[PDB]
Design an enzyme around this catalytic site. Structure first.
Site, PDB file in Angstrom:
ATOM      1  N   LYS A   1       0.826  -1.253   0.000  1.00  0.00           N
ATOM      2  CA  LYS A   1       0.000   0.000   0.000  1.00  0.00           C
ATOM      3  C   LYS A   1       0.854   1.296   0.000  1.00  0.00           C
ATOM      4  O   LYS A   1       0.462   2.324  -0.577  1.00  0.00           O
ATOM      5  CB  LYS A   1      -0.885   0.025   1.246  1.00  0.00           C
ATOM      6  CG  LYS A   1      -1.953  -1.064   1.263  1.00  0.00           C
ATOM      7  CD  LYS A   1      -2.929  -0.728   2.443  1.00  0.00           C
ATOM      8  CE  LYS A   1      -4.192  -1.590   2.457  1.00  0.00           C
ATOM      9  NZ  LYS A   1      -3.973  -3.057   2.514  1.00  0.00           N
TER      10      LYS A   1
ATOM     11  N   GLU B   1      -9.824   6.343   4.358  1.00  0.00           N
ATOM     12  CA  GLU B   1     -10.565   5.321   5.094  1.00  0.00           C
ATOM     13  C   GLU B   1      -9.686   4.099   5.384  1.00  0.00           C
ATOM     14  O   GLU B   1      -8.737   3.840   4.647  1.00  0.00           O
ATOM     15  CB  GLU B   1     -11.768   4.840   4.176  1.00  0.00           C
ATOM     16  CG  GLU B   1     -11.429   3.758   3.124  1.00  0.00           C
ATOM     17  CD  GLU B   1     -10.508   4.156   1.967  1.00  0.00           C
ATOM     18  OE1 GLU B   1     -10.321   5.372   1.704  1.00  0.00           O
ATOM     19  OE2 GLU B   1      -9.949   3.229   1.268  1.00  0.00           O
TER      20      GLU B   1
ATOM     21  N   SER C   1       2.046  -9.696  -1.063  1.00  0.00           N
ATOM     22  CA  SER C   1       1.620  -8.307  -0.869  1.00  0.00           C
ATOM     23  C   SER C   1       2.027  -7.728   0.485  1.00  0.00           C
ATOM     24  O   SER C   1       2.152  -6.503   0.603  1.00  0.00           O
ATOM     25  CB  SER C   1       0.107  -8.162  -1.191  1.00  0.00           C
ATOM     26  OG  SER C   1      -0.662  -9.076  -0.380  1.00  0.00           O
TER      27      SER C   1
HETATM   28  C1  LIG Z   1      -4.767  -4.150   1.943  1.00  0.00           C
HETATM   29  C2  LIG Z   1      -3.953  -5.364   1.598  1.00  0.00           C
HETATM   30  C3  LIG Z   1      -4.439  -6.230   0.603  1.00  0.00           C
HETATM   31  C4  LIG Z   1      -5.790  -5.960  -0.068  1.00  0.00           C
HETATM   32  O1  LIG Z   1      -5.970  -4.818  -0.832  1.00  0.00           O
HETATM   33  P1  LIG Z   1      -5.786  -4.815  -2.367  1.00  0.00           P
HETATM   34  O2  LIG Z   1      -6.181  -3.448  -2.722  1.00  0.00           O
HETATM   35  O3  LIG Z   1      -6.691  -5.886  -2.940  1.00  0.00           O
HETATM   36  O4  LIG Z   1      -4.354  -5.112  -2.720  1.00  0.00           O
HETATM   37  C5  LIG Z   1      -3.702  -7.305   0.274  1.00  0.00           C
HETATM   38  N1  LIG Z   1      -2.495  -7.637   0.897  1.00  0.00           N
HETATM   39  C6  LIG Z   1      -2.030  -6.813   1.864  1.00  0.00           C
HETATM   40  C7  LIG Z   1      -0.770  -7.221   2.526  1.00  0.00           C
HETATM   41  C8  LIG Z   1      -2.742  -5.685   2.253  1.00  0.00           C
HETATM   42  O5  LIG Z   1      -2.242  -4.898   3.234  1.00  0.00           O
END
Ligand SMILES: *Cc1c(COP(=O)(O)O)cnc(C)c1O
Ligand SMILES: *Cc1c(COP(=O)(O)O)cnc(C)c1O
Ligand SMILES: O=C[C@H](O)COP(=O)(O)O
Ligand SMILES: O=C[C@H](O)COP(=O)(O)O
Ligand code: NA
Ligand code: NA
Lengths: 390, 267, 390, 267
Positions: free
Chosen positions: A86, A108, A376
């Site tokens: 993010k 948010e 992610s």
């Molecule tokens: C917020 C988050 C997601 C989900 O959000 P996306 O917008 O679908 O990427 C996925 N993995 C992590 C580690 C997150 O912090």
């Protein structure tokens, strides 16, 4: 009238009250201008490199794949500053806010990762940040709430509706409807009204660009597929974007299956919900038969966005990307497996993506395939959850 | 039907502005909401603006968020709202009835089907709060095929192109916003709206009803003096509901007193 | 007889029972061989780059220094896999273990970061890991203990003595005294018997090497000083090593002052303890007047090693490095300041280093100085501690 | 003085091995430890090996870790240990008294001063457990200046260079380790030690006392048969203390029975 198409096929649009349309048009124009501006691009790259830690590693996982013909790499967004992908797009959006002369940020958050991300970018860049968060989420994410406040952001609990992410989304828009002249709304995923789906993809697309260069260096060819979890769609579109025109590369997105699709307790609106209009866009939604919006359920708090980015609905409709789901128990199994075999603790969000890769490997162990999973985020935040279940 | 046109003609003959209250259908229960509505009309409402409970009312401040919460506690559904509307029309043949809706409830079972249902029960207009002019095409087309006036908001930050669009596309009345922000009686608009009002008349827009923050008689007379055809008040009405939940009889008495006062100010 | 000098001036040595001397000689010879082996060096570099995320960023902190003539950079070991610099040297030691044909790892840990680090390296490289941890530390580090177990290590509580780090150090050595034929002891800092001080410095010295190249690129000159916290001495010697021959570059190490040196509740043996012989080495120790070893006290759990690496005692004695201390309240203030002004949450260990840099700036704000602080780790682990105090 | 030399000569004249118990001074209190020691001697101990409580006894298994914990609960300090030693020597003029120490307690107030204190109270030897031969120079030199025999451990993993060093540097006795690991009666050494023993005699080392894991009579006779001059037993003795803490009288009776049995096995 807009500079860029607000739709991906039938999905997307700008379904906000009229009073917010000038703010969206202003943002779209600032973005188009920034994207042609070498100084903005240099500034963004400098923060990505010297503050956030880009490029992130591409790690091969030979212990996981031993005995099979799968080769698996993980793109290491867990190593980015903040612990999740993010951070990339909040830095770009913070810079767009300054380019437009705004000094305040509204954001948010559900699980809190977007709120921490927004607070850190705003602390670095001198912006005054206020965060909306469903009161039920405030109660269960005390660590994140305290991090936001340590970073100087104001965290405002939202008690309306279900007191979770969708209600914080509403409250953010109610505030911006009255404060858009001084405040930029730093939306947390590749969804909402145009131009957000487009800006968030472009400020995440370095994930896929780096992956492509890294895989070509290490294997001399593109992946057979790139796999990413889909909460709202940002990490997945950032991984997919640079490969969309590479027709041989599969794009697989993984929504949370919760307790199982058949139970109805899931968070998979793209494949198991119904198109609606909410949060500024036309897209697949979790909703009742009468059209009231409902929550997404997952063991992972961060896959809670009850809709999905319109670009994913479009890529699905034309069959360029495939979407599947993974249940809570499958995600937990993948989390345990990565910890034990590679010494990496993955976020339970990312674990959904890794679980689907493991299924691709295990179900056809003699199929030759080169896979990349977008890792992610890191999962240190999830150890209590996992401990309590186990 | 041409209920708004007949109303505004009548009112013009008496040099009067319209006073138009808003309530959320089914707040705080179906039976009481029906009684509330009859009281608003008996006490002098010239038209009604009515909301259908929705999970995520992103154009509304806390007062109306709470009306929605109350209606949901009573189990109020869109289908129940449509039955109420039919009943309201059967009692009152000429009063204009306008809905203020969120997009998902209109699109849910098909946009055309929504407008057809409104025509079947006798609704005169629909404002969809989260559909700007730029996205309105299927909504306005469906409205017009079913003899429903599509309503647009004219915001304070409106430019000339928007005024022309609003004037061209809208029917029945134009919703002139008092200010930026969301609904709520606490926050009063103070911007001069004279210029927007004249520009709308120059472009032959539907007559303007001022709304958002109108909670007192002097604001009704001010709107009419500036050239608007009337004024809408919602949060102020809804607050009378919220403060009187424990005494339904006292709730109707206070609603009567307030609507009578607001209507007197339009004369 | 050894290949390399086991002493730094009067400090260091090999004070272990005779039965462990062959294991130390074997390790020293394996290390000397590995350091000349291009294949070992390539393998280590590959894990550092593609698994751990090296090189780490060097981040300039202009919001912190505004209004002064200090320029401050942070070397971002908080962005290394695991969240702290310890990951660098456990990967090298794991590779030395395999080079010698060992299949098992023994490690000690206080706050748990070394245990997590040892477990992750052992999971990646196929080694069976057992960790010793004082039972008082087990009780207060449940998160780390669970991470170690998720990674497949066995965690063994130690109830003898004070049931903290020194007692885990003893127990590790008792085990190795009986299992050295199959097990390598993966010591957690640049201390203990030779060759450990030397191996841990060389497996951390990429911190200073990268810093040097990064600062030359960004400023065209070396720092006026590099500043690092000193628990046992590993992150600090890794930052200092490459600058030792650059005589103009100050080397400042920061021990924890706890409640204040005058209170006796501190962890600053280098400047305020007395030389003794313990844990295999002659070095400054926390100890009573009669020679019993005592604990180090700090708000930061990880600056708990009750002695210090012999190389630091030597650099101090000849005046090449200067050592100071920072109290709990000074460290807490630096932690708050970094969070709010740069959006980075620093480990409370690293906060000691940053606090001393802030004092150098604040006490003489018109002095021109280019400073680098080694940000040894991230502080997400410290937010409860900080929350409770505040 | 030459107490070890006089002892081993006497024992050789009777074709006997030495039996040498270990205890931690002050476990479980000063007075009881003094009584324990007198009982060990009365029951047939030929020499004593004695520990000084230390915070971090890294060569010891749990039995001796616990003896140290007990001594610390009693407040036992090194200075109190030295007073005990003086008192033990005043009662018993010929028995060899050897200390088994950790380095920090020897180095603390000066290595030379430590050895001088040992000579003042009548100690005959010191083994420093965490000082290998390679670091022993200042310790052995200080020992010899104060007529104290410096003792070295000959481990099972000893090579020829180490045997030569041990034989050259040591005096009084050589500590022949039964096995790798740390002290403890549970774990018995089973390696053949005949070769080490012969090599030490070939190099004219001080006579060998086997130690670590010796807890039964048959192990005493086995050590003597293999060519050692005797055997040391510590954990086995200390366990008798630990199991009898609540009955000091029964504790001395059982110590007597055990030492008598172990000493009989050396004849
Ligand atoms: C917020 C988050 C997601 C989900 O959000 P996306 O917008 O679908 O990427 C996925 N993995 C992590 C580690 C997150 O912090
Ligand atoms: C362990 C640790 C330290 C202390 O150990 P050193 O060996 O002195 O570096 C410092 N900072 C962090 C973040 C740690 O985890
Ligand atoms: O049109 C309906 C709105 O509720 C009117 O605004 P208000 O609630 O601020 O009076
Ligand atoms: O020399 C003293 C040791 O305590 C002897 O070993 P042990 O305890 O295994 O008998
Ligand atoms: Na979703
Ligand atoms: Na220390």
């Amino acid at each position: 009238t807009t500079l860029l198409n607000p739709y991906f096929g039938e999905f997307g649009g700008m379904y906000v009250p009229q009073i917010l349309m000038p703010a969206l048009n202003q943002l779209e124009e600032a973005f188009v201008s920034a994207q042609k501006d070498p100084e903005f691009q240099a500034q963004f790259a400098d923060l990505l490199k010297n503050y956030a830690g880009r490029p992130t590693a591409l790690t091969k996982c030979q212990n996981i794949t031993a005995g099979t013909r799968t080769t698996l790499y993980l793109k290491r967004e867990d190593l980015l500053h903040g612990g999740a992908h993010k951070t990339n797009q909040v830095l770009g959006q913070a810079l767009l806010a300054k380019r437009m002369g705004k000094s305040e940020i509204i954001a948010e958050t559900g699980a809190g990762q977007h709120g921490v991300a927004s607070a850190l970018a705003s602390a670095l860049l001198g912006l005054k940040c206020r965060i909306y968060m469903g009161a039920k989420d405030v109660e269960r994410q005390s660590p994140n709430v305290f991090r936001m406040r340590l970073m100087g952001a104001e965290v405002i609990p939202v008690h309306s509706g279900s007191a979770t992410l969708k209600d914080a989304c509403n409250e953010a828009l109610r505030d911006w409807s009255g404060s858009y002249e001084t405040a930029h709304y730093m939306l947390g995923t590749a969804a909402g009204p145009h131009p957000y789906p487009t800006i968030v993809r472009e400020f995440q697309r370095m994930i896929g660009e780096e992956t492509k260069a890294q895989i070509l260096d290490k294997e001399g060819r593109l992946p057979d597929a790139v796999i990413a979890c889909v909460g709202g769609g940002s990490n997945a579109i950032g991984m997919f974007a640079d490969f969309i025109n590479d027709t041989s590369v599969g794009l697989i997105g993984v929504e949370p299956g919760g307790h199982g699709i058949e139970t109805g307790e899931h968070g998979a609106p793209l494949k198991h919900g119904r198109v609606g209009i909410y949060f500024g866009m036309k897209a697949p939604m979790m909703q009742t038969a009468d059209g009231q919006i409902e929550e997404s359920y997952s063991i992972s708090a961060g896959l809670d966005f009850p809709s999905v980015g319109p670009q994913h609905a479009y890529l699905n409709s034309i069959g360029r990307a495939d979407y599947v789901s993974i249940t809570d128990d499958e995600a937990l199994e993948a989390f345990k497996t990565l910890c034990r075999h590679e010494g990496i603790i993955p976020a339970l969000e990312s674990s959904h993506a890794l679980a689907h890769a493991l299924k691709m490997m295990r179900e056809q162990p003699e199929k030759e395939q080169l896979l990349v999973v977008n890792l992610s985020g890191r999962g240190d935040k999830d150890i209590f959850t996992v401990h309590d279940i186990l | 039907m041409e209920r708004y046109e007949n109303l505004f003609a009548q009112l013009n003959d008496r040099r009067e502005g319209a006073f138009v209250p808003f309530v959320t259908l089914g707040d705080p229960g179906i039976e009481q909401s029906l009684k509330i509505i009859d009281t608003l009309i008996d006490a002098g409402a010239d038209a009604l603006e009515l909301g259908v409970p929705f999970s995520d009312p992103l154009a509304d401040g806390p007062t109306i968020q709470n009306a929605n919460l109350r209606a949901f506690a009573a189990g109020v559904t869109p289908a129940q709202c449509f039955e109420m509307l039919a009943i309201i029309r059967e009692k009152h043949p000429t009063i204009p009835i306008g809905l203020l809706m969120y997009a998902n409830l209109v699109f849910n079972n098909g946009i055309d089907a929504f407008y057809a249902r409104c025509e079947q029960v006798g609704v005169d207009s629909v404002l969809v709060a989260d559909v700007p002019v730029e996205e309105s095409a299927p909504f306005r087309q469906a409205a017009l095929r079913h003899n429903i006036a599509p309503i647009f908001i004219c915001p304070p930050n409106a430019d000339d192109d928007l005024l022309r669009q609003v004037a061209s596309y809208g029917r029945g009345y134009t919703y002139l916003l008092s200010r930026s922000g969301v609904t709520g009686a606490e926050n009063r608009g103070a911007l001069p709206l004279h210029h927007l009002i004249e520009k709308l008349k120059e472009y032959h827009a539907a007559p303007a009803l001022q709304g958002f923050g109108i909670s007192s008689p002097e604001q009704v007379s001010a709107a009419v003096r500036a050239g608007a055809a009337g004024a809408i008040s919602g949060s102020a009405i809804v607050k009378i509901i919220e403060k009187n939940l424990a005494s339904p009889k006292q709730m109707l008495a206070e609603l009567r007193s307030f609507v009578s006062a607001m209507k007197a100010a339009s004369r």
